[PDB]
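Handover notes (outgoing to incoming on-call)

Open items:
1. Mast/stem cell growth factor receptor Kit: sequence verified, structure written out, both below. Nothing else pending on this one.
2. Nothing else urgent.
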Amino acid sequence: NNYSYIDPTQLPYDHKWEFPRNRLSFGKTLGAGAFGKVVEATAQGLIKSDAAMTVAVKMLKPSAHSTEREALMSELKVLSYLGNHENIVNLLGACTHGGPTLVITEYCCYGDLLNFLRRKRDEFVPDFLTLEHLLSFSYQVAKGMAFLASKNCIHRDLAARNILLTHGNITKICDFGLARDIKNDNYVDKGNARLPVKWMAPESIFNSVYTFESDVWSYGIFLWELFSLGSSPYPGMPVDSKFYKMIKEGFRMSSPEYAPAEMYDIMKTCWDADPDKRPTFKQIVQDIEKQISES
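Mast/stem cell growth factor receptor Kit structure tokens:
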């Protein structure tokens, strides 16, 4: 086999991202979890030498084993191979010299899109959250995911909680810890971890398989989150044996109150039990673009 798919995680770490550790001043903790924590920080001399820059720094728990350390370097290498895009939390640097690996990414001041919709829900109108912002959010997330799919990458945890918002109502997909390049192929996950069942495609729940089409299913659930203004999916349906039975038999959520028919038509195709009948993110983008032109 003289031809091979290049594994981005097998490539060496590019030290063009290396940033001096002593030039980071940590601030308030933005979020924590089983992985570790993401803290807001000031990068002194990151872009401009004498200009401090507010950034986000992802780090592991101090008790992380050797396998947990090598996983954070892989995500760094994946983000390096992915490249920059406006609709993803882009990589800005890294601290890799003989210490706890620090991943420096872009900072999004308005937080996650899920909590943003919930505080602006009471003041929603068809400084106000409008329908035009929801269509713009759906459009930007479709573009970021189309950029990921164009690089043969799956996110595997697409949800409104993982969409960040910054200045200018720009949405960026974040959290690439489970992002996988599946060029060889498409990805069967084997591990012990809590899973977001209500966002997962049926094949992911029953066979633990993840593809471009499973990301499309999650995007449809994200659209329901967006046009229901941050409500939990499948309200009144706990994750139990009856939930799996209904999902398998074809139960789907009805249209949210503020979703246009064309947008709900996208959700239904995203929720097709046949993965090959679901649209691609490239198709979703061209569909939303035709909708936005009509104002």
